[PDB]
Amino acid sequence: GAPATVTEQGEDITSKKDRGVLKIVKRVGNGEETPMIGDKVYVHYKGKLSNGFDSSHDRNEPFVFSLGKGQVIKAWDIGVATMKKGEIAHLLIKPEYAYGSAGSLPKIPSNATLFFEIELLDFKGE
Ligand SMILES: COc1cc2cc(c1OC)OCC[C@H](C)n1cc(nn1)CCCCOC(=O)[C@@H]1CCCCN1C(=O)[C@H]2C1CCCCC1
């Protein structure tokens, strides 16, 4: 399934090249501006523990956050910074770039790998 495909084919977008955040572009976006630290970012997403979703669509609204401000897991600050408006991307994320050994119960156990599909809807500078 889609997590395994990211394992096999995804790009390592970590600075350390530790395969902590792996990415596949599923639909190409437009623009050649990507988000930068500080921007207010609007996305839809579906996420799950890699072993099989929480979705923004379950709440009938986009998920909104400020990029690079630690309002989200590290993997999202790294990954969304690579995305163009209109892009749909898949991320597979090791615990070091998500919730680590502590986890975040009840939704996330210790040492969890996470999978997201993210659509970047829009972004605006602070
Ligand atoms: C660990 O807690 C959660 C994790 C995740 C979703 C969570 C969540 O809270 C309980 O509820 C989403 C809906 C509530 C109303 N909420 C929380 C936040 N914004 N809205 C702020 C959430 C900040 C933490 O989440 C994240 O950084 C990432 C990336 C942004 C979307 C949510 N996300 C998650 O890790 C998801 C998680 C839920 C279980 C399956 C894997 C994805």
**Where does residue 63 fall: left (phi above 0), alpha (psi -120 to 50 degrees), or beta otherwise?**
beta
In the numeric block, the tokens 């994320």 are attached to: 93
H or E stretch including 54?
A: strand 54-55
Pair of tokens at residue 17: 């090249």
Q: Give the binding-site residues of ligand 1, using a 6 Å CB cut-off.
A: 45, 47-49, 54, 63, 72-73, 76, 104, 107-108, 114
Q: Tell me the three-class secondary structure of 56-111, residue by residue.
A: HHHHCCCEEEECCCCCCCHHHHHHHCCCCECCEEEEEECHHHCCCCCCECCCECCC
> Residue 28's closest CA among 71, 86, 74?
86
- The count of other CB atoms within 10 Å of the CB of residue 102 is 11
Instruction: Report how this structure was experimentally obtained.
Output: X-ray
Centroid of ligand 1 to alpha carbon of 61 (angstroms) = 14
Cβ-contact 41, 9 below 8 angstroms? no
In the numeric block, the tokens 């395994």 are attached to: 4
* Resolution, expressed in angstroms to one decimal: 1.4
> Residue 52's closest CA among 3, 121, 109?
3
Pair of tokens at residue 79: 């990954």
Query: Best of 41, 48, 49, 54 to mutate for ligand 1, by most ligand atoms within 8 A of CB?
Result: 54
Tell me the HSE value of 6 on the side-chain side, using a 13 A CA sphere: 24
Supply the residue whose CA is at minimum distance from atom 6 of ligand 1. 54
- The count of other CB atoms within 10 Å of the CB of residue 103 is 15
